Design a protein around this ligand. Structure first.
Ligand code: PHN
Length: 330
C-alpha cells in the first residue's frame, strides 16, 4: 500500500504545516501537525477542557463506531518549545491520504497548554519519530508509520514541504518526479528516538564550504533551523544590522535586508536554503526588525534541522531495518 497527502502552511510565515487525517467511522477529518520529532498521535477532542478549545476541530470518540477506549492508558507530553498536552487513549481507524491503519492509538487530549489553544489551525499532532519516544503509559504505543510500515510497498515516508505553498507527505513510495538530481542517504542514530544524523558542513551565501560535523535531528515539527553558535554567528555576520537580541530571544535583522542563502552538507551533496526562507517577519506587528530563521541551538542541547532546512529538500525517512535519511534538492 501507499498513501499521499497534501500538507499546507498554517500561516504566511510557514510557522507549521497541517495535513488532513481521517479518524474513526464515519471519518472525522482533523488537520494535524506531522512531527518527525515526536512519537504521539494526539488530538483535540470532546474530552478537552472546554476553555482550552478555541476554534480547533475535535475528535469525538463516542461518535466513532470503531473507537475503543484503551483501558487504563494515559499520555502526557512536553515539547521543546515549552508547550504540553495530556489525556487518555483510544484505538481507532486512522487514514492518511488513502493509507489506513486499524487499531491506531489516538491520544485524546483532556488538557492542552496555552500555545495549543491559541493556535486554531492545529487540531493535534501526528508523531513520526521512533516509537520508543511514545508517552503512552503503562503500555507504550506505536506511531502511525510504525503500524503501517509492514503493509507499505517500501518502508519509507517522504516530506516535501513547500515554501509559502502546499507540499506533500507520501507513505510507502518515493515520487521520483518530486526532486532533482539524486537522493543522498546518510546514517541515522535512533539512540535518542529521533531521526538523528550528521551534516558534513555548511556555507553562507556564495562563501567557502566549511567541512565540520554537525549532529542534529530532522524535525518537521520545529519551525526554524537551530545550529551551533559558531555557525549561526557566521551566518548573521553577513547581514548588515543583524544582531542577537536577548529581549526578543534570538537573532533579528532589518526587515529591509535581503538575506544570503545557507548551504548544509549531506555527505558529499549540498542542500541550499534560499535566503528568503530565513525571513520570519516582524518581531512584533508593524516592527521593522525581523526574526531570523537560523538560530543558535546553544540552549537546547541538540541541533534541529527544522522546517527552514527541510523545506529546501525532498527528504526520505527510510524505516528499513537499518533506518537512514535521504536528501535531494528540488
Ligand atoms: C518560530 C519561532 N519563533 C518565531 C517565529 C517562528 C516567527 C516569528 C517570530 C517573531 C519573534 C520571535 N520569534 C518568532
Amino acid at each position: 500500500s501507499t498513501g499521499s497527502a497534501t500538507t499546507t502552511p498554517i500561516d504566511s510565515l510557514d510557522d507549521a504545516y497541517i495535513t488532513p487525517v481521517q479518524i474513526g467511522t464515519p471519518a472525522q477529518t482533523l488537520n494535524l501537525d506531522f512531527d518527525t520529532g515526536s512519537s504521539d498521535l494526539w488530538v483535540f477532542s470532546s474530552e478537552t477542557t472546554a476553555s482550552e478549545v478555541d476554534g480547533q476541530t475535535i475528535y469525538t470518540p463516542s461518535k466513532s463506531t470503531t473507537a475503543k477506549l484503551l483501558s487504563g492508558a494515559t499520555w502526557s507530553i512536553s515539547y521543546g518549545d515549552g508547550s504540553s498536552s495530556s489525556g487518555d487513549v483510544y484505538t481507532d481507524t486512522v487514514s492518511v491520504g488513502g493509507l489506513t491503519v486499524t487499531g491506531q492509538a489516538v491520544e485524546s487530549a483532556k488538557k492542552v497548554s496555552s500555545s495549543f489553544t491559541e493556535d486554531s489551525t492545529i487540531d493535534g499532532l501526528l508523531g513520526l519519530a521512533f516509537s520508543t519516544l511514545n508517552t503512552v503509559s503503562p503500555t507504550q504505543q506505536k506511531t502511525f508509520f510504525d503500524n503501517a510500515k509492514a503493509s507499505l510497498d517500501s518502508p519509507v515516508f517522504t516530506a516535501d514541504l513547500g515554501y509559502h505553498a502546499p507540499g506533500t507527505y507520501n507513505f510507502g513510495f518515493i515520487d521520483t518526479t518530486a526532486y532533482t538530481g539524486s537522493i543522498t542517504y546518510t546514517a541515522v542514530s535512533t539512540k535518542q528516538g529521533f531521526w538523528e544524523w550528521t551534516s558534513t558542513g555548511y556555507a553562507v551565501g556564495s562563501g567557502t564550504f566549511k567541512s565540520t560535523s554537525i549532529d542534529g535531528i530532522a524535525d518537521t515539527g520545529t519551525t526554524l533551523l537551530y545550529l551551533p553558535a559558531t555557525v549561526v554567528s557566521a551566518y548573521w555576520a553577513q547581514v548588515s544590522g543583524a544582531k542577537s537580541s536577548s529581549s526578543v530571544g534570538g537573532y533579528v535583522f532589518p526587515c529591509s535586508a535581503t538575506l544570503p542563502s545557507f548551504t548544509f552538507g549531506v555527505g558529499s551533496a549540498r542542500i541550499v536554503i534560499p535566503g528568503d526562507y530565513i525571513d520570519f517577519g516582524p518581531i512584533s506587528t508593524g516592527s521593522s526588525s525581523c526574526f531570523g530563521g537560523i538560530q543558535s541551538s546553544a540552549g537546547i542541547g541538540i541541533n534541529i534541522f527544522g522546517d527552514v532546512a527541510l523545506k529546501a529538500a525532498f527528504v526520505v525517512f527510510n524505516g528499513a531495518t537499518t533506518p537512514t535519511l535521504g536528501f535531494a534538492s528540488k
